[PDB]
Amino acid sequence: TSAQKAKAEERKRRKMSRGL
Fold it and tell me: What sign results for the dihedral spanned by CA atoms 6, 9, 13, 17?
């Protein structure tokens, strides 16, 4: 699924420490 692919790509910039 689209969200599932987020894990196989969001390795970099793992959401900085800013819940913006």
Answer: positive
